[PDB]
Automatic annotation (TrEMBL):
The keyword Zinc applies. Zn(2+) 1 binds at residues 179, 183, 189. The keyword Calcium applies. Keywords: Calcium, Metal-binding, Signal, Zinc. It comes from Akkermansia muciniphila (strain ATCC BAA-835 / DSM 22959 / JCM 33894 / BCRC 81048 / CCUG 64013 / CIP 107961 / Muc). Zn(2+) 2 binds at residues 282-283, 285, 290, 293. Ca(2+) binds at residues 282-283, 285, 290, 293. This is Peptidase M43 pregnancy-associated plasma-A domain-containing protein. GO terms for molecular function: metal ion binding. SUPFAM superfamilies: Metalloproteases ('zincins'), catalytic domain.
Amino acid sequence: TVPDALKDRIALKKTARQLNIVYFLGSDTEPVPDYERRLSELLLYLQQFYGKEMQRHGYGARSFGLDIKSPGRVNIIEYKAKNPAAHYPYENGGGWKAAQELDEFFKAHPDRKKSQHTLIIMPTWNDEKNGPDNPGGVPFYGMGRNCFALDYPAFDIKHLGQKTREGRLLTKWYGGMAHELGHGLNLPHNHQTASDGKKYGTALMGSGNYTFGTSPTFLTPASCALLDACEVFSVTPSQQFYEGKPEVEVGDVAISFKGDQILVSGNYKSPQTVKALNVYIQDPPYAVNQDYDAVSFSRRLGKKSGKFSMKIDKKELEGLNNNEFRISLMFILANGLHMQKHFTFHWDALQDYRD
Ligand SMILES: *[C@H]1O[C@H](CO)[C@H](O)[C@H](O[C@@H]2O[C@H](CO)[C@H](O)[C@H](O)[C@H]2O)[C@H]1NC(C)=O
Ligand SMILES: [Zn+2]
Ligand SMILES: [Zn+2]
């Protein structure tokens, strides 16, 4: 009743809001056997992974909330859809269709909604391409505060780390679920620093979907700073999330280059508390699936207005190899919204930036 991988687990702070878990079934789709137990186990270990990383970065034993209905069992919403599986494929807006339909279900059942974040899980298609040994066919990506992942018969934590085909399949699809969940929890892509790579392995939001459960995987300081401001990590029930717009005035921005150091400073002002500053440094190009290389850094602010100052060591920018690079400054607000300002430089014509 408790798998070995969960015998080592920490007590977590109760949260104000919980991630919804939906097991989403096409009108013609059969559940994968034993999914309540298998998925509860995988989700609780996932909750442990995020909570231990939050703790290791100084936030205490905080993870995303889950609605737990009895020991070791997540209260998973089993949703029978209006249409057959074919109507919600990986391609062509299948994920938007499922997610819009679940909105109707949550309007019709507000008691089942515990936050604005949902992980929708669909059983693998079984056809000439996909099946138990090669799952796929369904949405598998982040979509706003929602994210999509899949289930298949060997999707079972007992295979975690085993040097077998089931174990390798698990790291692929469990790492996959972990990464897409990161997106649903307001995480962008980021790459580990050089020192963090040697200490802790692969950033989950970089290439960690290939490593989770097999070699060391972790959450960066910047990832944890965003989770710190994510609705389902809240231990503060008075705090409302995602309403309105990010309002931050950033002024007196300076970025200067001195020897090996990158100096970043400025001031900020917001009607909300500004929790933190994340900095992303990356090579071009800069699109949303071309930023696995953005090496991130983070600093605690914690005021509605003030100054920020930060020295970044150039030698930590592991993997960057372009003459051209971009520094992004990300201001994270207490209600989970954020704003970004971007700056482009060239290493062979490095120009300090002012104003
Ligand atoms: C990214 O890695 C994932 C595992 O970590 C996974 O392989 C994903 O691939 C998609 O999986 C979907 C599951 O329904 C579909 O089968 C889809 O066709 C397939 O590409 C990987 N993404 C990409 C873009 O390859
Ligand atoms: Zn991604
Ligand atoms: Zn890039």
